[PDB]
Design a protein around this ligand. Structure first.
Ligand code: GY0
Ligand code: CL
Ligand code: CL
Ligand code: CL
Lengths: 295, 293
């Protein structure tokens, strides 16, 4: 059982999401979805487990995505999502059933890297959990053409046209900047899930992003921001066969963390299946174990 | 005589500045001022020399600064300033006297680093001039305190209050993050500079500026500038941006480049006084040589 809980940002935007409350006053986990994904995809299964084990759990749609406010639509600014998490933490910490001293930031894929950026600046975050985080986006060979495409979109917007939209992965599993396994098995699998005409419980999901998302991704240096995360206990869950975010890149980032940390590799899992199938129950139990051990 | 020229951004914000036109059609230099500085500080003298040598020149107040649109006021987002430059390049390139194939980005201090970020993405920028670029902002000892103050400003705003404002340099020359020589000679010189014809100059910034500086990693973005001819002018005695940091970034550039160290000059005096004429002529010569259409 969950209730709809809305969080206001400092610029007046409403973040909308699901809040799985627990009885009494207990800790809270705030879950951020992956790139352009909505709260209804996969995460409600994890939240019910978190809730049954005594954790208030909040899954939300990030700015301009799903049920949440934000214009232009599906313009993914990771630094803005990280800042919004500070405002989300504020509202969730004020809820009656929430112990504000026991806040954990949980993120999957893109949302895991966004969560770490928020934890670097917000000491209210007592624990960080990153599932298959993505730390790079541009293929060097496609940079110049993607840049030119971004500029021409700006000029097109200055002439009155709408911001150019496109799927994060086309039918060939590709995208202009080559992110997240574009041109390989991972991008093809990503398109298969995002483009499927299936009821996933998320009417407001949209398999399109604004092209200017790639402009924000060009500024973002997440590997440098994660170096600021030097106090928050961090748990990283990496799929062994991640074809969208190279496991070695995730492992290189985990190496730099000097504080209390824990690494878990999900054998035989990919970017999208790391929290599903056999072994997924043991992985989720390890997440709550790590939080309680550090909360 | 200069004319007021406005540049619309993709989100509808109006950027305002001075345009120094030349007869006929010719190259254009877009000058970005330093941290929270207005177009009337120092730069008009440089633009008149550029104009007399055949260069259209556009000095502008960045977003939320001076005469330009932008809210909240004096919130310095360098990444947004970099994106705004793409729109500024678009409007300046459309002007009758401007050769759209001969656009040069020019920046001083903070504005020099912002110009490099815009040059990394826009191939219309045919040359880059960076004057005393600043490439780091946080002192490690002040990081956690500044981060906590930023979160508390967010909680204050969420209760309905205006964003917390403060001078970028106090009377001791300090600021919460330790940027631009805070606590030493650099900060005191910047405090005196900010403290004494721009009606909309405001000696204050939003605290949330420091949140934007925390995300910024310009040393990594400067690595993307691998094609644009770049001239860097570094003061030998820069007390606000370490010369070693400026030189280290310059040495990484693989393309056509030139480095000039202004002997005995500081962050704010690099383009003033003795030897400043030769530095400006070195800029015009680098631009004529590298941006020929
Ligand atoms: C069998 O389980 C599944 O297929 C669920 C697939 S959606 C999911 O994992 C929830 C979402 O937060 C994570 C998305 C990662 C893909 C987007 C990535 C490019 O950032
Ligand atoms: Cl929709
Ligand atoms: Cl032209
Ligand atoms: Cl020719």
């Amino acid at each position: 059982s969950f209730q709809v809980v809305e969080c206001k940002t400092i610029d007046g935007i409403i973040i909308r999401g699901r809040f799985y409350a627990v009885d009494g006053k207990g800790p809270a986990i705030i879950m951020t979805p992956g790139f352009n994904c909505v709260k209804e995809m996969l995460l409600p299964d994890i939240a019910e487990t978190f809730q049954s084990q005594g954790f208030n759990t909040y899954i939300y749609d990030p700015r301009s995505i799903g049920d949440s406010d934000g214009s232009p639509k599906n313009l993914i600014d990771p630094l803005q999502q990280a800042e919004d998490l500070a405002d989300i933490v504020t509202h969730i910490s004020s809820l009656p059933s929430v112990d504000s001293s026991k806040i954990t930031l949980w993120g999957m894929s893109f949302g895991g890297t966004v969560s770490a950026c928020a934890a670097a600046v917000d000491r209210r975050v007592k624990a960080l959990v990153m599932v298959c985080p993505i730390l790079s986006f541009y293929q060097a060979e496609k940079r110049d053409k993607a840049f030119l495409q971004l500029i021409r979109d700006r000029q097109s917007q200055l002439r009155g046209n709408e911001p150019f939209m496109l799927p994060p992965f086309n039918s060939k599993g590709e995208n202009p900047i080559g992110m997240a396994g574009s041109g390989g098995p991972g991008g093809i699998e990503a398109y298969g899930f995002m483009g499927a005409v299936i009821d996933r419980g998320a009417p407001n999901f949209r398999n399109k992003i604004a092209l200017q998302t790639y402009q924000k991704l060009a500024w973002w240096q997440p590997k440098e921001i994660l170096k600021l995360v030097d106090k928050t206990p961090v748990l990283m869950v990496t799929p062994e066969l991640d074809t969208m975010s190279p496991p070695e890149e995730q492992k290189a980032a985990f190496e730099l963390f000097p504080q209390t940390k824990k690494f878990l590799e999900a054998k035989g899992k990919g970017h999208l299946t790391v929290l599903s199938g056999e072994g997924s129950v043991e992985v989720v139990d390890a997440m709550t174990e790590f939080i309680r051990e550090n909360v």
